[PDB]
Structure formats: structure tokens, C-alpha cells
Design a protein around this ligand. Structure first.
Ligand code: ZN
Lengths: 351, 789, 127
């Protein structure tokens, strides 16, 4: 594919006329990669107009798929394009990337067939430190800083030392501090993926929030409420809202079949419910402790040979639909052991 | 559309800067005191201090330094505001008329560049040739000190080190050199760079990068014959000159990190030190070359922001949180040890976290009670018109909230004290505070190192004698937020409702909170109703005999039953986290820290809350108040005030649910709380009365006005700017305009009382120059606007 | 982990012919082994992602399953009997190297081979 270097960015709140692709229906996140393939000659014609212009095309955030109604949308840039003449007809492959959020003013459809939209660029307001407006001239040098529990305790007391001057305390501003908030998302991100925050996760607060917006299952409505955000602090807060509202535990392959819930999560191990658990070969799997779990079949027999939990036999528990290795069904051998039967599902299969 | 008047009733008292030199005369020693926007001039005397001239400036003072270049007999003062305005001033006195003049004026703000963590560092070369200002990370501004440089030309030189902790100018050098400590992935190093005016580029210094302490924060310039710079961190006081390096680690400075420093001797032998715990230390230099550095404790003073040495052991403590003290030091006389003696105590109201207008003795004239100071400097202040009399009540603990009960005749004050962790397993107070010094103590019902632990207490203080009668100690890991004193339901007794929240180091969001109820009768405090809720209780308000409490984001209302218990009625969920609550009649105001205003009204027919109008704009919010049914006063980021008006006569649903931002004004002060009423005795051309307390101690009043009064005052403002000379030649239209790091907007729907009232102070020809389209007819109108405060 | 592509069921390069030995290897050998109860974890290739076995393909360079053998005999991929015979043999051996004796999954593989060996002993000569 033919690569591009140029980066185009329109002015804030300035009204711009940008065409909308009809094939694109899904809501776009700023900076998100989109693999498109357009067959229609008039659709390939719009792309041919963009490359010579500025490669910036509009993607509507459709509130209702029926009436095609969309109050918001995101601008997408064509960084790569390829024109392959396959079996006789002209086909184009377009790689899109989000640039700026926008408010839809008016939807006007041309006599040619394609549709255009009156676009107003949403201001990406980036607020700095909350302490910046109240920090004393003497404590200014203490702001720079050279076991994870100890760090955050010292981080709060030092950066937010001027909290006594305001009506609100130290810990209150932590709920609004980007660095503190980013760590809360990182915590639950580790509860699903083994990837370290050093390389897989970005450092910039605005960019980091946008990546999360896609992974976590968010229906159009949540995605719109997620885009109405024009500031980093409003984005991470909303990501925490999703983490504290949709606890629905499913299978990573099924995505629809329910395994268990947050209510059934019980603390047996002293680390909590889930910690690192290695079987005979050398696999590091984080095993969840739950009372009851639905949609799980029992294959073979429960063997007591190398059991993580003390004196429990592990039956090979699998899903009823995809047949993925979800975890185990630990049963008590002795009559004086409780919980008698509880599920030992690994993180890798848990959603 | 809004039309409002904002006048400074009380000037800010918190000292931000204090330097000693020769401003008025070359022979007379002068002390300059900076109080946020106000400037004070004093002549150093053996008895104390003498006042000569006090001038108001149109900018938040951040940089203030005295220097003497060649040709000039007396020292010139350099002032840099928060609005980035460089100005050089000199004292002028002929017969009786005093007029401070500006030799050079100009702006030093750049269109590109992010503000640094340390902010602005103001340092001027000892030989008085150049001014060094670190405004942004990695960028260094150099402004020359010449007679030709009147417009103040500035150039930014690219520096390799982004994160700079503290920068100062070196002594005993031909070319100007800057010494600084930077942070990098390796640790912390001290580096020097030589400045050249010709090349306009940085060059190699007198010595290479040397390794220092991991917590090295302060850098002090050392004059001749010693030379070099002293670097003090948290544990030790290091010395550098090149090949020469001296290190001493005192255990007495380990208790609290030194934040401020001052030079005593003209050669560099004695140095005043001030930590976070208000302790006063002395840095002694032994002797061309240094023999050894000695650190000695003097005593206990106010939490110093900046120290200054005057004459004959008289030291002026510049405190932002506590009272400014003129303390005497006993360094001399080997017979008796080092002891500090306070001589004069300057009243400091800053900071103000909670305030109330309560009639105590007058029953007509409003008397304001403020929760001033922090930590050991935390004290109660009673303000009334005399001139304004201030009555101080020490607490020795951080005050949070205040409430009044006319039935029990006492004040309910929230307090937070610091208690260090014990080796065996417990806590012990640093010094006896109002809570431990109380007549009677009480504890709540329980459920289920070397670290400072914050413990909360509910204080009961008298309204005439001001004595700590009762103190209610709060549970472990519990933080108090809201406290209201009002009658609930059909109950005739007046209760104190507490909106506590459980804070844990591991729990970022508070998942636990209590709604404790207290009654005060026969000089005894008692627990009435305990209501545990899943979340934090930030703010509470009374709604027609019912208690409204906010749990995280949700807004809840409680009914007061005959069983003396709190009962849930209806829950109103919200997208944003509820933090600010204000009410009048039926209208309820909701606000967060991200400046997302939301108006709700309790519909009693359906038995719930209906969303009326909402305004979403991202900014750091701090304080809010309802002016009327449509107008509401709010305080946001970068020391500004805003007013948003709704329209009940809007033809479209989208218009009436939208709030129009009609109010824009830069106060130059940070407001944390708002309360109704007036300090004066109760035919006013001003509508309503809203008083406010700030971080620096500046107390003012916000009041609505009519359409005619606004235009009459607005046109007076543009004329007064022409006659009144601005201190530093900085525009009033630029200073009062809405300021933010991303945008600048003009002031609308606001009238500055500071410029209107100045018409009485200025002379008669300047009075006649404004009224000319009447001179004495306008005076009576200005005099009407002075009576209100 | 990455799942490698399934083995080629139909290929134009490799020669193929319809013999009576392959007819018996589909209607008698395959059918009986397919209708058995312990045949379900072999009716498809052992998935490295579903069962979470990433080092499975790192050891087993030649993986096979009955599902591949069923399509190969139906689409006619083998020339002689030995090519179809080698496919069944590799199938069982792969699990024997990976899964240690005593496992429930080992017991099924062995149960199918006993029924496989009794039928392959009755394999006729080419017509
Ligand atoms: Zn599944």
C-alpha cells in the first residue's frame, strides 16, 4: 500500500465541509486504525478526490441506524491507499486513522449520490494539573519525584500538599488526577491481559483513554457518551464508570454465553480471589474463585494430582458452545471441607 | 445581561514575597512586602517598622527582587506578574507627593510552550547585567539590563534539561553563570552553564556535572570570598565550587524539609532556614575557603513561605497560611541558648475554607466567622466593622467546616489533626490542639512505620467567650466533609448532621460513608441517628424540613420521621460526580470539579427530581452560589468568576435546557466557599449580598445591578484608566479579562469596585476630566457603593 | 498464541487414485472410529487458543486429526493405503508424546487404536 507522511489538522470550532462515506456505519475513535475496501466506482471516486485534497473524510456516529440520524462524528485520515485492478473492475483498499471529534450541524445529500455534512470541530480541551492553580511558591520544587502501595501514598501527600488551603482534601483530587486514574484502568487491564503497561500501554493521558474505548464492549450509546468527552479527565472517569457498571462475565470466544457474575466472586486465597497459579508443565494462569457458574460442561474426571487449592480434585471444565478451556470444578475430598464445590475458571477465557 | 458589582472589602494579608535592600533612599534600609496584588513599602527601624506608601498592582506578584546597576544610586525593583508582565520600578518623593514610576514595561509570554512543574523562577545576576526567567520546561528566557532596553526584548535559549528544580546566579565570576539541579532517568545532578550575549547560545560553565542527593531541591548562591552554591535536600546540606566539595548530614532537618532561605551576612557566613513545620534553622559557614558547615535550631515560628533579615536580630516571617511575625533571635550571648521571641503579630486571614455571617452581639450588623490557617496555624477569626476588627481564636489543628445553632448558642466546627504512628500500635499528637484541650471528649460506635495519620474531630465552641466545650473524635480512616445545623421534619430540637466518608489507601473511590446526627442540650453532645451509605457524602443542604445528601454521583433526600431516624424517599442518579450543592425554595444546584453545571428541581407531584438546565464546559471548579432563580455565581480555574443565566421564557425546549454564560471576570483570587449576607448594619441601589473568602485572605462582596447602573459604571471604567497611572504600565482591560492557558476573553456582566472607589482617592482635576461628557454629583454615587461593605 | 493452517485435504500437485483399500479405510475403518464415544476431541484439530495449549504445536511438528482424514478420503487425496495408514498413526502418536499417561484424553486415543488395529488386520489387497 502507498504510504503518506503529511498530517492535516483543521482549526477548532471552525466550520468545515467534509464528505461522509456511506459504507462506514461504525463509530470511529480518534487515532483508531480502520481497514476499508471500497468496490463502488462512485465510492472509489470520492477517495480519488480526497488523496488530491487532504485525505480527511467524515465518519458519522449513528444514534439510530434506521433513520441514519447522527448528532456527532469523527474525522478520519487516509494514510495508506492501494488501487488494484482485480478481474476487470476498479477496487480500492483504504487504511483510515482518527484525527478530531466533531458536531454534526446539517446532513446534505448530493444529486450525484454521495452525502456531505456541515461539520464543526469539537475543541479537545486539555486541562493541566488541578494543583497548578493552588500550589505555593515554596512547595513548587517538591512537585518533581525521582512496592506499588507505598509510591501512591507519597505521591498523593506531596503533589496534593496544598489541599488544606482548599475546601476539598488530597484524595478527592486523586479521583480527578489523570496519572492516578490511568493506574485504575491499568489494574483491571491486567485482570484480562498479561501485557506489561511499559510497552503495550501508552503514556499520554488522552491517547491511553481512546485505546480502552474500543476493547471494552461498548454499545453505540456508551460510545457516544464516551465521545461527547472533549477532555482527558472526562474520558478516564467514564472508563471507570464502565468498569464499575458492566461486570458481566462471559467467554472471550462466545462473548454472549454467560459463565458467572461479580456477586459470586469469593475470597478463599489470602491474595484475594485471583492470583498466579501454575500447573505441572509451566503455564502461569490466574484462577478465579466463584460459588456457582452457569453454561459449563464436565469432561473426563477430577484428579487430585498437583492441585493449586488445598485438597480439592479438579475436573476439566469446558464451555457448552465454543468448547474452550474455561477452567475447573474443584470438589472437596473430605466431608469436613467448605466450600464443598466451587469453580476455578482461568482469566484467559474470562471476559 | 447579568450586571454585577465586585468590590474588595478586605485586602489580601498572605505574604508571597519579601526582600531587603534600599528602595526609597541609598542610606535607608527598606523592606518590601508583597501580598498577592498589593505592594507595601517600609523603612527598617530599631523599634520595628515604619509605613510610607502602599500601592495596588494589576497582577499576581510572583517575582520580586532588588538590584543595583552602574550609575544608579538607589536599588530598582523587578516585578513579574502571573499574567507574564515584566516591570522595573523606582521610588520618587518630592515634598509630599509620592509617585512610583516605571522605567521599562513589557510582556514576556510565549505563544508556544507548556508551563513547568516548578512554574516561574526569578533570578537576576549579581553584577546586574541580565535577568534570568525559567517560564517553560527546557526554555530559558534572558532579558538584558540596559538603558536602551525600554521595550524589554527577550530571547529563549534551548536547554537540554527539561526538568529544572531550582536555578540561581553564581558569585565570583566574570561572565554570567547559572547553577541548577536537574532530574533524569539516572537520578539528580548539579550542572553549570555560561551565558554569552553575543552568541545568544549556552556555553560550558566553571565545572562539569556533579552527582547530588536524590531529593536535592534547594540551591543557594554563595558570595565572595567563599563563592559557589550550597545545595540542601531532605537529609543533608551539600557544598560545591568545583574541586571543593563539603558534605554534612544533620538529623534535626530530617524531620521537615527546608522550603525557604535568606542571606544574613554580606559575605555569606550566616543563613536563615525555614522548613514545612515552621522550625527556624541556621546555616553557619566557617573560615577564602570553607572549613565546615554547621546547622543549628533556633526555635518554632510561623510556617514561613519566604524569610527576610532586617536589623539587630529582627527577622520578619512571611507566612501564607499563618500570621506574619517580627521575631527576635538570640544567636549572641553564650550564657543562654538560642530562643526566638515574637514582637509583632500581623493579622493573616488566608486561607479561608469556610465562612458564615452570624449576628452575635449586634443582632443587626453582620459578624463574619472564618476557618483560617492550617495545621498548627489553624485559627478562628471574627470579623466586624469598627476599619475592620479581627478576633483570633487558636485551635492548633486544620479547620474544615463551620455551622451555627441559635438554640444551643454554640458553633460546630470540623477539625483534622495530625498524629504520628506509634511503635507498639497507636497514635500520638505532635502538640496539644483544641480537640485534646477540650473539657469533654466523645467517641463513635466501632465496626469490624513512622507515618502521619489524619484524625477528625467535631468541635463545640462558645459564641461570646469562644471556649472548646465538647469534642467528638471520629473513627479510624474516616474523613469529615459536610456539616449542617438545622431542624429536621416535625422535630423541634436543632441537630448537627455530619456527612463523613471512609478513606482507605487501597480504596481510591470511597465505598463507605456515614450520616451521623448530633444534638446539643444541657452542655452535652449525643448521637441521635446513624445512616451508613454505599459511597461518600460531599455536601448537604436543607430542603423544606428535609435533608438532601449526595452519594458519589446520586442525589438523595431524607425524611425526618417520628422514630428519630433518617428515611430514604427518592434517588436521583447523575452522569457526573456530585460535589457542590446549593438550594433556595425548590431550585437545586449541582456541580463537580470539571465545571459541569446542572440545575434540578424537586417535583413533589411525582415525588422525584426533574432535569431543568445543564451547562458542560471543562475547567477546574472551586466554589458556587445561587444569586436568584435564573442567575448563579461560580468560581473556576486561573482565578476567575463566571455567571450563567437560564431563560424560563424560551420558546424552544433546547434553549430553556441550555444555560447562557453571561458573566466573565478575572478576580486574581481563588474562592473555595460562598455564603449570603452583609457585614454592615441591616435604599440600596445594589441588589443582593454575597460575601466570599479566599486563599490569600482577600474578602469581597458580589451584588447584582440594574441595566442603567451597569452602563453608567462601565463607561466610567474606560475613562478612569486614562487618568489613573497603572503600577507597572500594564492594561486594566488586559488584567481584568478572562485568563486561561488556552484562551483570553474580554470581561462582560461585571463591574470592578476597586476602580470605581479609587475616584474618591484621586485629585480634583482628574475628577473633572472623567465627568466631562457634575464632579461633586458623581462623588455621591461612588460614596453610595462604599457603604455596602 | 497463533493457530497454524489446517492440513491440505485436496491438493492438485500430490497424485491420487480410487482403490478398494481406501474404500475400506472410509466405510469400515473411519465410520466405526467416528461413531465411537471417545472420538469427539479428534473430529477436529486440537486448538491451541480454545484449549490454551501454546507449546503443543512447538513440540508436535506434524499434527493431524480425524476431521482432516475424513475430508481427504471423501475428496480422494491418497494414492495407496500406506498414505492413509500414516495419517491415522501420526494422529494417535502426537497425543502420546504431549499428554503423559494417566490422563482421560490419553485413554480415548488408546481406545480408538484397539478398534483401528482389529479392522486394519482385515485390510484386503489392491484390486
Ligand atoms: Zn464460550
Amino acid at each position: 500500500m502507498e504510504e503518506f507522511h503529511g498530517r492535516t489538522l483543521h482549526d477548532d470550532d471552525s466550520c468545515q465541509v467534509i464528505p461522509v462515506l456511506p459504507q462506514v456505519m461504525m463509530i470511529l475513535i480518534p487515532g483508531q486504525t480502520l481497514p476499508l475496501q471500497l468496490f463502488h466506482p462512485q465510492e472509489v471516486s470520492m477517495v480519488r478526490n480526497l488523496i488530491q485534497k487532504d485525505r480527511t473524510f467524515a465518519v458519522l456516529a449513528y444514534s439510530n441506524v434506521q433513520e441514519r440520524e447522527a448528532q456527532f462524528g469523527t474525522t478520519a485520515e487516509i494514510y495508506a491507499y492501494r488501487e488494484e485492478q482485480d478481474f476487470g473492475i476498479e477496487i480500492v483498499k483504504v487504511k483510515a486513522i482518527g484525527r478530531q471529534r466533531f458536531k454534526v450541524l446539517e446532513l446534505r445529500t448530493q444529486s450525484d449520490g454521495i452525502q456531505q455534512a456541515k461539520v464543526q470541530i469539537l475543541p479537545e480541551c486539555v486541562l493541566p494539573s488541578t494543583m497548578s492553580a493552588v500550589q505555593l511558591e515554596s512547595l513548587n520544587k517538591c512537585q518533581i519525584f525521582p512496592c506499588s502501595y507505598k509510591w501512591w501514598q507519597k505521591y498523593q501527600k506531596r503533589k496534593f500538599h496544598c489541599a488544606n488551603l482548599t475546601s476539598w482534601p488530597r484524595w478527592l483530587y486523586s479521583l480527578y488526577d489523570a496519572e492516578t486514574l490511568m493506574d485504575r484502568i491499568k489494574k483491571q487491564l491486567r485482570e484480562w491481559d498479561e501485557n506489561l503497561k511499559d510497552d503495550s500501554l501508552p503514556s499520554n493521558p488522552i491517547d491511553f483513554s481512546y485505546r480502552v474505548a474500543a476493547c471494552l464492549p461498548i454499545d453505540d450509546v456508551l460510545r457516544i457518551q464516551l465521545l461527547k468527552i472533549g477532555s482527558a479527565i472526562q474520558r478516564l472517569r467514564c472508563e471507570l464508570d464502565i468498569m464499575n457498571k458492566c461486570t458481566s462475565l462471559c467467554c472471550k470466544q462466545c462473548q454472549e454465553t454467560e459463565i458467572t457474575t461479580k456477586n459470586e466472586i469469593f475470597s478463599l486465597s489470602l491474595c484475594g480471589p485471583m492470583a498466579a497459579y501454575v500447573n505441572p508443565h509451566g503455564y502461569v494462569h490466574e484462577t478465579l474463585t466463584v460459588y456457582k457458574a452457569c453454561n459449563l460442561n464436565l469432561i473426563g474426571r477430577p484428579s487430585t494430582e498437583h492441585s493449586w487449592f488445598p485438597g480439592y480434585a479438579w475436573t476439566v471444565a469446558q464451555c457448552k458452545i465454543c468448547a474452550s478451556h474455561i477452567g475447573w470444578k474443584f470438589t472437596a475430598t473430605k466431608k469436613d471441607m467448605s466450600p464443598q464445590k466451587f469453580w476455578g475458571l482461568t482469566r484467559s477465557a474470562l471476559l | 445581561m447579568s450586571y454585577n458589582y465586585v468590590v474588595t472589602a478586605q485586602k489580601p494579608t498572605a505574604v508571597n514575597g519579601c526582600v531587603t535592600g534600599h528602595f526609597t533612599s541609598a542610606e535607608d534600609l527598606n523592606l518590601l512586602i508583597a501580598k498577592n496584588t498589593r505592594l507595601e513599602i517600609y523603612v527598617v527601624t530599631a523599634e520595628g517598622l515604619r509605613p510610607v506608601k502602599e500601592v495596588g498592582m494589576y497582577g499576581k506578584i510572583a517575582v520580586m527582587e532588588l538590584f543595583r546597576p552602574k550609575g544608579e544610586s538607589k536599588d530598582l525593583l523587578f516585578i513579574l506578574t502571573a499574567k507574564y508582565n515584566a516591570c522595573i520600578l523606582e521610588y520618587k518623593q518630592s515634598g509630599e507627593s509620592i509617585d512610583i514610576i516605571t522605567r521599562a514595561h513589557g510582556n514576556v509570554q510565549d505563544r508556544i510552550g507548556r508551563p513547568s512543574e516548578t512554574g516561574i523562577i526569578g533570578i537576576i545576576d549579581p553584577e546586574c547585567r541580565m535577568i534570568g526567567l525559567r517560564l517553560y520546561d527546557g526554555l530559558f528566557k534572558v532579558i538584558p539590563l540596559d538603558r536602551d532596553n525600554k521595550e524589554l526584548k527577550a530571547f529563549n535559549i534551548r536547554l537540554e534539561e527539561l526538568h529544572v528544580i531550582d536555578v540561581k546566579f553564581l558569585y565570583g565570576c566574570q561572565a554570567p553563570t547559572i547553577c541548577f539541579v536537574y532530574q533524569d532517568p539516572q537520578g539528580r545532578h548539579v550542572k553549570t552553564y555560561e551565558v554569552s550575549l553575543r552568541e545568544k547560545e549556552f556555553n560550558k560553565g566553571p565545572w562539569k556535572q556533579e552527582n547530588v542527593e536524590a531529593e536535592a531541591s534547594m540551591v543557594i548562591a554563595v558570595p565572595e570570598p567563599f563563592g559557589g552554591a550550597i545545595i540542601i535536600g531532605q537529609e543533608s546540606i551539600t557544598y560545591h565550587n568545583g574541586d571543593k566539595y563539603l558534605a554534612i548530614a544533620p538529623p534535626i532537618i530530617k524531620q521537615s524539609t527546608i522550603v525557604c532561605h535568606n542571606r544574613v551576612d554580606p559575605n555569606g557566613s550566616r543563613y536563615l532556614l525555614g522548613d514545612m513545620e515552621g522550625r527556624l534553622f541556621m546555616l553557619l559557614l566557617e573560615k577564602v575557603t570553607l572549613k565546615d558547615l554547621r546547622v543549628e535550631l533556633l526555635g518554632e515560628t510561623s510556617i514561613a513561605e519566604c524569610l527576610t533579615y532586617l536589623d539587630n536580630g529582627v527577622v520578619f516571617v512571611g507566612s501564607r497560611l499563618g500570621d506574619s511575625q517580627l521575631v527576635k533571635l538570640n544567636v549572641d550571648s553564650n550564657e543562654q541558648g538560642s530562643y526566638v521571641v515574637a514582637m509583632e503579630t500581623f493579622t493573616n486571614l488566608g486561607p479561608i475554607v469556610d465562612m458564615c455571617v452570624v449576628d452575635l452581639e449586634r443582632q443587626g450588623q453582620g459578624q463574619l466567622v472564618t476557618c483560617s490557617g492550617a495545621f498548627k496555624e489553624g485559627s478562628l477569626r471574627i470579623i466586624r466593622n469598627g476599619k475592620l476588627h479581627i478576633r483570633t481564636v487558636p485551635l492548633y489543628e486544620s479547620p474544615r467546616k463551620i455551622c451555627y445553632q441559635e438554640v444551643s448558642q454554640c458553633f460546630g466546627v470540623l477539625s483534622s489533626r495530625i498524629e504520628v504512628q506509634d511503635t507498639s500500635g497507636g497514635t500520638t499528637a505532635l502538640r496539644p490542639s483544641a480537640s485534646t484541650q477540650a473539657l469533654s471528649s466523645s467517641v463513635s460506635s466501632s465496626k469490624l512505620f513512622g507515618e502521619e495519620v489524619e484524625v477528625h474531630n467535631l468541635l463545640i465552641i462558645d459564641q461570646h467567650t469562644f471556649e472548646v466545650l465538647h469534642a467528638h473524635q471520629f473513627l479510624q480512616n474516616e474523613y469529615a466533609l459536610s456539616l449542617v445545623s438545622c431542624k429536621l421534619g416535625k422535630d423541634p430540637n436543632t441537630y448537627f448532621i455530619v456527612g463523613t466518608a471512609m478513606v482507605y489507601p487501597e480504596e481510591a473511590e470511597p465505598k463507605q460513608g456515614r450520616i451521623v446526627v448530633f444534638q446539643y442540650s444541657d452542655g452535652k453532645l449525643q448521637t441521635v441517628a446513624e445512616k451508613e451509605v454505599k459511597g461518600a457524602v460531599y455536601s448537604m443542604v436543607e430542603f423544606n424540613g428535609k435533608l438532601l445528601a449526595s452519594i458519589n454521583s446520586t442525589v438523595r433526600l431524607y425524611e425526618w420521621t417520628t422514630e428519630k431516624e433518617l428515611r430514604t424517599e427518592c434517588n436521583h442518579y447523575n452522569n457526573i460526580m456530585a460535589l457542590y450543592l446549593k438550594t433556595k425554595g425548590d431550585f437545586i444546584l449541582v456541580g463537580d470539579l470539571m465545571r459541569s453545571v446542572l440545575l434540578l428541581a424537586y417535583k413533589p407531584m411525582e415525588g422525584n427530581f426533574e432535569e431543568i438546565a445543564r451547562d458542560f464546559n471543562p475547567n477546574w471548579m472551586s466554589a458556587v452560589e445561587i444569586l436568584d432563580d435564573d442567575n448563579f455565581l461560580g468560581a473556576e480555574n486561573a482565578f476567575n468568576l463566571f455567571v450563567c443565566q437560564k431563560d424560563s421564557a424560551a420558546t424552544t425546549d433546547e434553549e430553556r435546557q441550555h444555560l447562557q454564560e453571561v458573566g466573565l471576570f478575572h478576580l486574581g483570587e481563588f474562592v473555595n466557599v460562598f455564603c449570603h449576607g452583609s457585614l454592615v448594619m441591616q435604599s440600596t441601589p445594589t441588589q443582593g449580598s454575597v460575601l466570599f473568602g479566599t486563599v490569600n485572605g482577600m474578602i469581597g462582596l458580589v451584588t447584582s445591578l440594574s441595566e442603567s447602573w451597569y452602563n453608567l459604571l462601565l463607561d466610567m471604567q474606560n475613562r478612569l484608566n486614562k487618568v489613573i497611572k497603572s503600577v507597572g504600565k500594564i492594561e486594566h482591560s488586559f488584567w481584568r479579562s478572562f485568563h486561561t492557558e488556552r484562551k483570553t476573553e474580554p470581561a462582560t456582566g461585571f463591574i470592578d469596585g476597586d476602580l470605581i472607589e479609587s475616584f474618591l482617592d484621586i485629585s480634583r482635576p482628574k475628577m473633572q476630566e472623567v465627568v466631562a461628557n457634575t464632579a461633586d454629583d458623581l462623588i455621591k454615587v461612588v460614596e453610595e457603593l462604599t457603604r455596602i461593605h | 498464541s497463533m493457530n497454524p493452517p489446517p492440513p491440505e485435504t485436496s491438493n492438485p500437485n500430490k497424485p491420487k487414485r480410487q482403490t478398494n483399500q481406501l474404500q475400506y479405510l472410509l466405510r469400515v475403518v473411519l465410520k466405526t472410529l467416528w461413531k465411537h464415544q471417545f472420538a469427539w476431541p479428534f473430529q477436529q484439530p486440537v486448538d491451541a487458543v480454545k484449549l490454551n495449549l501454546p507449546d503443543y504445536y512447538k513440540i508436535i511438528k506434524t499434527p493431524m486429526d480425524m476431521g482432516t482424514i475424513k475430508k481427504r478420503l471423501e475428496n480422494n487425496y491418497y494414492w495407496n493405503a500406506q498414505e492413509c495408514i500414516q495419517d491415522f498413526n501420526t494422529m494417535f502418536t502426537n497425543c502420546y508424546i504431549y499428554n503423559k499417561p494417566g490422563d482421560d484424553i490419553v485413554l480415548m486415543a488408546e481406545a480408538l487404536e484397539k478398534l483401528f488395529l482389529q479392522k486394519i488386520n482385515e485390510l484386503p489387497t489392491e484390486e
